[model samples]
Target: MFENITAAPADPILGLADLFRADERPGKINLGIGVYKDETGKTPVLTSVKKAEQYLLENETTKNYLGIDGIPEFGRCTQELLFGKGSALINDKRARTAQTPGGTGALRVAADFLAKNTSVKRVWVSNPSWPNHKSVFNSAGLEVREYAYYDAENHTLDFDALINSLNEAQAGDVVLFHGCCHNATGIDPTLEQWQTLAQLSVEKGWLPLFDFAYQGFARGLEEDAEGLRAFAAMHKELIVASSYSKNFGLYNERVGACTLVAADSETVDRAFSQMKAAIRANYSNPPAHGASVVATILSNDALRAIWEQELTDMRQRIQRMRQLFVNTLQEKGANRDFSFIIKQNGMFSFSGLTKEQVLRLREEFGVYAVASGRVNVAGMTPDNMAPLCEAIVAVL
Candidate 1:
């Protein structure tokens, strides 16, 4: 059996990272993965997280398991951060929350829950999404479908096509919507469009599954969650997967939460029971260190303020990098306008580079980006931007 097993392919994003590390070029840059880096070219630990860890070190005593749902404060703090403090959805008995390993774990738990409960035979996702979205759902034995989302021509949201395709969805289907700062493409629907989605989901009796990985990283936690809140307000049942990896810089901690909102208290309780059972069966329980650190900071007023400022700094740096790239590319006299990159939110920009161009950039200029033309804008800094832009212009 071992002899017959074949070699597997490396992860596309991580493969690029490995290649970048192997390159001997002095100015090589990696824009393939969506990890955030400051202008100083470092993935700094948040100061608030450090302070929270200090407090935890001094006050903590127990090393016991947190059960399937992980820490309670994590769930509660996440609820406040995502759904707003004291939201009716929170106050009501309709919603139940469970802690997950990460955003991927949260999505997996939701997929498994839907597989066991509703007649959700199929799930539809954006045309270009976090690569794992479809894979996770498929692992739960559900068929996955893609709807038109990004307009590659204009590098914007294809709202009309998206609405038209969603209109075709049948009752009981799961429509996965990015809460904000859509991954890969970085194109988000407008407020009016999200409202339309909420209304349509209600009319069609379809369930909305929200994947919110970059809440504060996009704009702010409160503003980024506007779409989920809008949908949860009207719909009887909604699913949400929130990640602390990006916003809290807790990537290795695997901190995340999954929430289910049902029409009644009994249903919410049942769903919670099933979700917890699945998590317990799968991973026993999530880690304690990261979740506890996040919870402590979020619960404290001073720590929360410090965390917010750090997040703002990260957001502003990414935006500034985007602007610099656009200005420099235009200065190169490239006929094509690349200003749409500046309008995109989150850490990514779906630069309109073809597969050939992407390959050329990697081979000739030591610039690494995803083959699909998605580049992590946050990877760029004032130091790296000039060389990166020069390579991009040459490829163009």
Candidate 2:
């Protein structure tokens, strides 16, 4: 039996990390992973998280399990944080939330719940989505399909194709959208486009499943959540899987929430019960540390203010880096027009490099990026920009 097991393929992102770590080169740059790094190339803990940990360290009493739904306050505060405090969905008790290990866990829990509860068996995701979306939904026994998203030739959104694809979706089919800061391709729909999609979702009777991995990283927390808010207002039912990893710098802590908006309070309660049952069967309960820290920060007025400022700082830095990168490439006289990098939001820019070019970039210059040309803009620094631009120009 042991001999029968074959070697599994390594994770693309983590595998790139491993290769980068093993390289003996003195100045190798890592643009493969999605984690945010400062101008100094460090992934620092947020000041707010540190303070919250201190508070929890002094006041917390037990290491007890937080039940199948996890910490009650975490769930409640997360719900309000995602949707505004007085949003009609929350005030009417139409939405239910559960704390999970991380955004991925939240997505898994939602997929499992849908698999068991709804008649829908298919989920429509954007083309060139986070690589794991396919595997996650497939693992939960849902058929995964892709809709037109990023237009590679022009480096913009393929809105017409997307709308046509979604229009073909049957009623009750789940359609996944990035709340903001689309992962592989940073291009997102404009507000008018979002409004059009919301109307189409209602008309087609499609169930919207939002993957909100980066909220504050895009524009601002409230502005980034506009798409989600629009959907929640228009539709009676929807799903949201949110992550605190990017904004809170809680990547290893695995902090996230899965929220469901149902038809009414009664439907919400029933949905909550099923969600709990699904979690119970899967992991029994979520871990306590991360949720507790997030709750402490979110619940406290001062800490919340600090967290927001820190998040703003991170967003601004990434934007600055994006601009610097585009300018450097232009100054270096690269053959292609790379100005699209500035327009892309969040930590990534789809640089449009092919597999061969990406391989050449890594092998020749030790600069690592996904084969699809998705570069973590946060990994870029003024110190590394010159070499990165040179390497990119050489490959071009």
Give the whole-model CA lDDT for all candidates, comma-separated: 0.86, 0.91
Checking candidate 1 for backbone clashes, the offending pairs are none
Give me the candidate number with maximum TM-score. 2
Candidate 1 local lDDT, 107-137, one digit each (tens)? 9999888888668989999888777887899
**What is the alpha-carbon lDDT of model 2 when measured against the actual structure?**
0.91
lDDT of 2 by residue, 1-396 (tens): 698898988888888889999999987999987798998888999999999999988998988778788888998898887898998898899988898999999999999999999898999999889889999999999999889998999999989989887777899899999999998789989888999999999999899999999998888989999988888889999999999988899999999999989989999898889999999998899989899999999999999999999999999999999999999998998899988888888988789899999999999999999877788998899999999999999989
The residue pairs found clashing in candidate 2 are: none
RMSD (Cα, Å) for all candidates, in order, is 1.3, 1.1
Give the best candidate by lDDT.
2
